[PDB]
């Protein structure tokens, strides 16, 4: 009955370490454990341990008994029932197949025999284990196209291209334009590198009433990129319209 | 484990119905100033026979756990019985059966006045 | 900023000794549902 | 079995904010001082040698020291403590000459 | 993994469908509890069922489980077009953790059909000034998710440069994949047309930009 | 019932974490003063 | 029906038996001048555990009705069963057994004290 979040999605060079946070709110942080799940695609979904914030005891697995370490954060009162926590996890000696999402998870009971049950989930931070380096994305403004002739519609947006590594969020309008947006997945090149595509379908009446802008955020390399997506087009099938 | 008086406000309802005696033990207890303690020790005992009373016309007289023949309602907070005696609060639980208190003590001596008269039927 | 001492009202001396401390009832009639019936 | 039945418990941990009529206690070497009842100890209860104390884990409730009433009543009690010990005491009329 | 699913398993709309859940002594199922959580990928997933037979809270009564001394189930009666996802069980205690299964994706069965929404877009002149050129294909609204996709030069199929991604599930219950082509900036000036075909069903659909206008 | 917050940093105001119960306060002397308090409970750690 | 606080005071004493329960509800009900109450709501629980031990030491304890083992004397106003329940109310029957009252009194905790004795026997 609360929320979950996490830390940014970072990249890590095998060896090294990482340290992946996940802050509460809306209940009582110290009535119930945090499993941690991870998901990479050559080992499918793979429980790690859970640790209880009220007596710091710990679960580990003993795939993960020997280079994972959990920590909790003291709680912060809030009100009489709610309050504020914090809760960290920290894997050692990074490996390929660690490449995948990573997940926290408030337990389901405080007493009985499915106590430390996942319940509540976060959202995932996703931990890219490769060698290569950060790369900042290209970010090319889609032409519009004509999607009716007949119903006045269309569909513009914006080509995020080579980038790496994985998210890549993209908006419109500062959060305002959220409506017909289609962002698809990204493809992994012969080089390594993703790039997706974002397009959002409006009418061709909306030209000097509103203004297009696509907002692409690739946190990894400390860059925003904001377009402006141009609203005359070249398709021949739209121009019937104008 | 004897917690203590109110040793088990934070435990969950099943925790807590362990104390129900120890919480219970401690609710009686056994010129001017000196009157303090007089009206006060005075409104300590009306607490006492305004709950006792209840109890008493209620299918418990006995004390500390009872049972009733009123079926709950599902409109008062629908949990489970792993929702609320394995993850709430006996503070917590009040809280929201607050507003269905004085709906919820009617029908206890009132399904109760008929299981009496009933009762003197089959003698 | 400036601070200068004052008083005068002296329900400010007890809160100093009194701020720990609050007073409640206890309500020992709760009811709760489970699986019983007489 | 499936269907729910209401339930009575007697002694619950449940308390709400309220107020009431507050004593004094004040220990028994207290009571030795003597010296004509100083200030306020007299039939007021001595202080049992037992000082109890528990604590409620996982608890947290919420204060506040600026709107408590054992200030108004700890401050009116010394207020009428005062006046009780000057009622029988020898009263100064004729000195305003 | 030691604990093993039914590898897939269908139904249709209005109906039941079951899901098997087993594997050695070791984990399942004598002592051992289960649970039921509905998982799409990329998303988070949600608690359906735990302790073998009891739902989560707020889990509609469309869900129950049962388990065996060898197995445990969980039938969804009341099919959803929401419910074509990914669902995994565990085998835990109060004590130990989870271990998860293999997974089962179920296919809801007796749906309507849905003809993809194609769009081709051309290399913006932004990226002819660098000098690239990438062609945008990207498929939408289709079910099932199984579409193919071959890219063709002037009428003649290509066999380099082309990358299609895998069809993913949308918000309204349908799939979407992307397809692209990497192209030399001479090579756009050199053919007349390019297309991309996305073959559904045997009914390939197509759509072609032309750089000579 | 009187409960005593009994955390070391505490504006007397909101939330405490560490609440225990108690029949009676400590002992408190009722020192009339002005400007400088007398004979008080010190507090704990920092200076509150 | 509910008639209130001694509804069916004119209602036959079978009529009144329904309302037991609320009569008995508000029999307890939870500087001078502020004494006017003190000494009178001190006077309103002496008569409430006075009424209780009599309730305690017969074989009632628990509350609202209660039988006894003492056979009734014919001399108390021989009546018959519909002569009394259905056509007679409990001020005008408690008129012709005031005489009575404190005779029947106390037979009911002897004999009382009788079957505890013989209870502890049989154990
Ligand atoms: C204030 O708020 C707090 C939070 O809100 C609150 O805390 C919560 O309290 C509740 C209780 O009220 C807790 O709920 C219970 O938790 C119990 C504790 O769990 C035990 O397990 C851990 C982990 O054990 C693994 O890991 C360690 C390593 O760290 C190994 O040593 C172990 O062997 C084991 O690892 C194995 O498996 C791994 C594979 O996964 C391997 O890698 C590994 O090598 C091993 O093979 C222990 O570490 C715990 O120890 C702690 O507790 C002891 C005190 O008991 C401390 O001394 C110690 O220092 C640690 O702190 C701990 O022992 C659960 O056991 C419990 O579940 C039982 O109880 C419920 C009812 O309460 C039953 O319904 C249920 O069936 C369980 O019953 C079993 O256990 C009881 C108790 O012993 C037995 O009597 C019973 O018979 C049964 O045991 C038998 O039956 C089983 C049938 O399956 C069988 O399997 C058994 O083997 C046996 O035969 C319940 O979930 C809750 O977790 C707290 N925390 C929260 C909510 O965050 C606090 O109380 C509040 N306070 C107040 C005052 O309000
Ligand atoms: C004045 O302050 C001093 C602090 O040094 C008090 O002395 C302490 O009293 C407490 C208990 O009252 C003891 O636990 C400490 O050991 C004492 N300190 C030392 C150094 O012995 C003294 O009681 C205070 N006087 C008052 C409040 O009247
Ligand atoms: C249960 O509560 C509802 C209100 O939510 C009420 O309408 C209904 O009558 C109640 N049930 C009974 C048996 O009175
Ligand atoms: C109790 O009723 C009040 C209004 O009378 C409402 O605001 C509150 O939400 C109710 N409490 C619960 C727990 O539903
Ligand atoms: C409540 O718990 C029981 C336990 O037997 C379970 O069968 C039932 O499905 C649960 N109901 C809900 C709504 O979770
Ligand atoms: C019944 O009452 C008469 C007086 O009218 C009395 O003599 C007699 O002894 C009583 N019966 C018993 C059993 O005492
Ligand atoms: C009760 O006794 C008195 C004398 O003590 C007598 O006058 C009166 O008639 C008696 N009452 C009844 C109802 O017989």
């Known amino acids: 009955q609360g929320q979950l979040v996490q830390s940014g999605a970072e990249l890590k060079k095998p060896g090294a370490s990482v340290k992946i946070s996940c802050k509460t709110s809306?209940?009582?942080?110290?009535?119930?454990?945090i499993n941690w799940i991870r998901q990479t695609a050559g080992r499918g979904p793979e429980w790690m341990g859970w640790?209880?914030?009220?007596?710091?005891?710990?679960?580990?697995?003993?795939?993960?008994?020997?280079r994972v370490i959990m920590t909790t954060d003291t709680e912060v009162p809030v009100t009489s029932f709610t309050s504020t926590g914090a809760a960290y996890m920290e894997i050692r000696n990074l490996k390929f197949d660690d490449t995948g999402t990573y997940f926290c998870?408030?337990?389901?009971?405080?007493?009985?025999?499915?106590?430390?049950?996942?319940?509540?989930w976060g959202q995932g931070t996703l931990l890219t284990v490769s060698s290569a380096s950060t790369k900042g994305p290209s970010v090319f403004p889609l032409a519009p196209s004509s999607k009716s002739t007949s119903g006045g519609t269309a569909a513009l947006g914006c080509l995020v291209k080579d980038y790496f590594p994985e998210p890549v969020t993209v908006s419109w309008n500062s959060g305002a334009l959220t409506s017909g947006v289609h962002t698809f997945p990204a493809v992994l090149q012969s080089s390594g590198l993703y790039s997706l595509s974002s397009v959002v379908t409006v009418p061709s009446s909306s030209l000097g009433t509103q203004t297009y802008i696509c907002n692409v955020n690739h946190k990894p390399s400390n860059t925003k990129v904001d377009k402006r997506v141009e609203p005359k087009s070249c398709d021949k099938g739209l121009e019937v319209l104008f | 484990v004897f917690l203590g008086f109110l040793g088990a406000a934070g435990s969950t309802m099943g925790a807590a119905s362990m104390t129900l005696t120890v919480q219970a033990r401690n609710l009686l207890s056994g010129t001017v100033w000196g009157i303090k303690q007089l009206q006060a020790r005075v409104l300590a005992v009306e607490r006492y026979l305004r709950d006792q009373q209840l109890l008493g016309i209620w299918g418990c007289s006995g004390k500390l756990i009872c049972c009733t023949n009123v079926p709950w309602n599902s409109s008062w907070s629908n949990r489970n019985l792993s929702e609320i005696w394995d993850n709430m609060t006996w503070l917590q639980w009040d809280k929201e059966i607050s507003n269905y208190t004085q709906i919820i003590y009617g029908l206890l001596e009132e399904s109760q006045n008929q299981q009496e008269k009933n009762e003197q039927d089959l003698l | 900023e400036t601070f200068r001492p004052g008083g005068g009202d002296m329900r400010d001396n007890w809160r100093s000794e009194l701020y720990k401390y609050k007073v409640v009832k206890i309500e020992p009639l709760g009811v709760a549902p489970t699986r019983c019936k007489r | 079995a499936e269907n729910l039945w209401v339930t009575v418990y007697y002694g619950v941990p449940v308390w709400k904010d309220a107020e009431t009529t507050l004593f004094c206690a004040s220990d028994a070497k207290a009571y030795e001082t003597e010296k004509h009842n100083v200030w306020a100890t007299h039939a007021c209860v001595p202080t049992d040698p037992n000082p109890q104390e528990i604590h409620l884990e996982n608890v947290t409730e919420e204060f506040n020291m600026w709107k408590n009433n054992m200030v108004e009543q700890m401050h009116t009690d010394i207020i009428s403590l005062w006046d009780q010990s000057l009622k029988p005491c020898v009263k100064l009329t004729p000195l305003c000459v | 993994s030691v604990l093993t699913q039914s590898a897939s398993v269908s139904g249709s709309l209005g109906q039941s469908v079951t899901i098997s859940c087993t594997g050695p002594n070791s984990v399942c199922c004598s002592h051992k509890s289960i649970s039921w959580y509905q998982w799409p990928p990329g998303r988070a997933p949600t608690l359906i069922i735990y302790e073998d037979n009891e739902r989560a809270p707020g889990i509609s009564p469309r869900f129950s489980g049962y388990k065996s001394y060898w197995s445990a189930y969980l039938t969804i009666s009341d099919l959803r077009p929401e419910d074509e996802t990914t669902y995994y069980c565990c085998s835990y205690t109060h004590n130990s953790g989870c271990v998860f299964g293999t997974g089962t994706k179920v296919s809801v069965l007796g749906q309507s059909k849905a003809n993809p929404s194609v769009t081709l877009f051309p290399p913006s002149s932004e990226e002819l000034q660098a000098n690239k050129a990438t062609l945008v294909c990207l498929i939408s609204d289709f079910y099932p998710g199984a579409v193919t996709v071959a890219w063709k030069a002037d009428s003649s199929p290509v066999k380099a440069g082309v990358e299609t991604t895998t069809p993913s599930k949308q918000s309204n219950n349908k799939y979407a994949a992307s397809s692209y082509l990497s192209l030399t900036p001479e090579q756009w000036k050199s053919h007349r047309s390019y297309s991309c075909q996305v073959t559904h069903e045997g009914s390939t659909v197509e759509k072609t930009v032309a750089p000579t206008e | 019932a009187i409960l005593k917050c009994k955390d070391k940093k505490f504006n007397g105001t909101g939330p405490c974490p560490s609440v225990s119960t108690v029949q009676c306060t400590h002992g408190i002397k009722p020192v009339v003063s002005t400007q400088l308090l007398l004979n008080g409970s010190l507090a704990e750690e920092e200076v509150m | 029906v509910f008639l209130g606080f001694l509804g069916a005071a004119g209602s036959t004493m079978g009529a009144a038996s329904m309302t037991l329960t609320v009569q008995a509800r508000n029999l307890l009900s939870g500087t001078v001048w502020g004494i006017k109450q003190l000494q009178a709501r001190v006077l309103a629980v002496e008569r409430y555990l006075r009424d209780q031990q009599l309730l305690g030491i017969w074989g009632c304890s628990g509350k609202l009705i209660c039988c006894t083992n003492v056979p009734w004397n014919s001399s108390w106003s021989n009546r018959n069963l519909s002569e009394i329940w259905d056509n007679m109310t409990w001020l005008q029957w408690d008129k012709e057994i005031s005489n009575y009252t404190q005779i029947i009194y106390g037979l009911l905790e002897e004999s009382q004290n009788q079957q505890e004795k013989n209870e502890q026997d049989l154990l």
């Open positions: 998870a408030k337990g389901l009971l405080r007493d009985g025999s499915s106590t430390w049950l996942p319940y509540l």
């Open positions: 640790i209880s914030p009220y007596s710091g005891d710990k679960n580990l697995a003993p795939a993960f008994q020997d």
């Open positions: 809306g209940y009582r942080f110290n009535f119930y454990h």
